Amino acid sequence: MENFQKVEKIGEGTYGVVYKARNKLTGEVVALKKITAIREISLLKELNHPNIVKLLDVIHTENKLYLVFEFLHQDLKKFMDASALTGIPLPLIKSYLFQLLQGLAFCHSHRVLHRDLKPQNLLINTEGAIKLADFGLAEVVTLWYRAPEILLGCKYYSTAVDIWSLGCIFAEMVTRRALFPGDSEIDQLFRIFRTLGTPDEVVWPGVTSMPDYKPSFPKWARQDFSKVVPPLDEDGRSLLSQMLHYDPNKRISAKAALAHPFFQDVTKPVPHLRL
Numbered sequence: 001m002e003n004f005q006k007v008e009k010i011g012e013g014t015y016g017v018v019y020k021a022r023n024k025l026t027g028e029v030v031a032l033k034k035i036t037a038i039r040e041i042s043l044l045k046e047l048n049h050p051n052i053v054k055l056l057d058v059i060h061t062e063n064k065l066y067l068v069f070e071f072l073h074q075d076l077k078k079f080m081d082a083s084a085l086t087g088i089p090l091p092l093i094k095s096y097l098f099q100l101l102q103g104l105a106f107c108h109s110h111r112v113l114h115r116d117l118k119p120q121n122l123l124i125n126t127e128g129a130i131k132l133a134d135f136g137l138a139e140v141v142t143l144w145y146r147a148p149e150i151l152l153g154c155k156y157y158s159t160a161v162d163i164w165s166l167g168c169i170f171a172e173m174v175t176r177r178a179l180f181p182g183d184s185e186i187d188q189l190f191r192i193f194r195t196l197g198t199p200d201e202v203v204w205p206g207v208t209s210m211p212d213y214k215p216s217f218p219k220w221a222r223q224d225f226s227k228v229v230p231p232l233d234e235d236g237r238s239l240l241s242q243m244l245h246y247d248p249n250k251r252i253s254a255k256a257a258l259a260h261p262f263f264q265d266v267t268k269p270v271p272h273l274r275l
């Protein structure tokens with residue numbers, strides 16, 4: 001747009017393309033994303049929290065829509081890829097998890113869901129902050145962080161879907177491998193079932209009456225969490241287990257998760273970021 005000078009292409013998305021850009025007015029360095037949306041997006045402009053990437057402005061113009069965001073220098077996917085020989089130190093993982101849970105507790109209190117949390121939409125800065133990006137906005141779309149209720153075809157899913165996605169990210173930080181790297185919808189589902197056990201009416205009341213549930217799904221037994229995320233300690237395994245409960249109603253809320261004993265000794269480390 002007239003008021004912005006493109007600096008470089010950050011990336012490419014489900015909807016549109018993302019540029020690092022400078023405001024010739026404010027001097028401001030921002031990220032520009034080019035794609036009843038107007039009213040929904042306007043509502044996102046007021047959803048302000050230290051752990052949500054600030055939506056600065058919305059520009060509708062020429063049947064194109066531009067979202068102007070706060071710019072951050074790195075995403076968690078890149079930071080995980082760069083930290084993979086060493087692993088992200090546990091106090092930083094814990095700090096990131098806690099902050100994201102704060103962000104989620106906020107948005108969820110306002111009945112706003114992210115719906116597509118993934119390392120790529122978690123942005124970090126040199127100060128040790130992490131932020132939820134592309135919030136309430138909802139190449140091959142990644143399935144790896146999708147909650148089972150979405151995969152089984154629930155139309156009216158809840159905030160719990162974000163807790164699921166964040167649990168998957170927690171596990172990946174800890175182990176340095178994706179928890180459930182599905183490359184199709186059924187592969188994603190069956191990867192979950194192979195680890196967590198095929199769900200049934202005992203652990204998830206109503207599951208067998210979900211739109212895409214099939215009685216023909218193979219019945220796999222649950223694995224122990226000790227095997228899933230070693231060497232994460234008993235507090236973290238406990239918390240992760242609660243974020244990965246099948247029944248969205250049993251699944252821990254962000255607000256309750258913040259009170260979990262895992263965070264008794266949370267601190268805010270500085271990451272080593274090479275930009």
Ligand SMILES: CC(C)c1cnc(NC(=O)Cc2cccnc2)s1
Nearest residue numbers: 010031069070071072073074075133
């Ligand atoms: C669209 C909006 C949510 C964003 C705001 N800040 C962003 N930063 C990066 O994607 C990280 C990055 C990648 C490549 C080059 N520079 C920064 S994305």
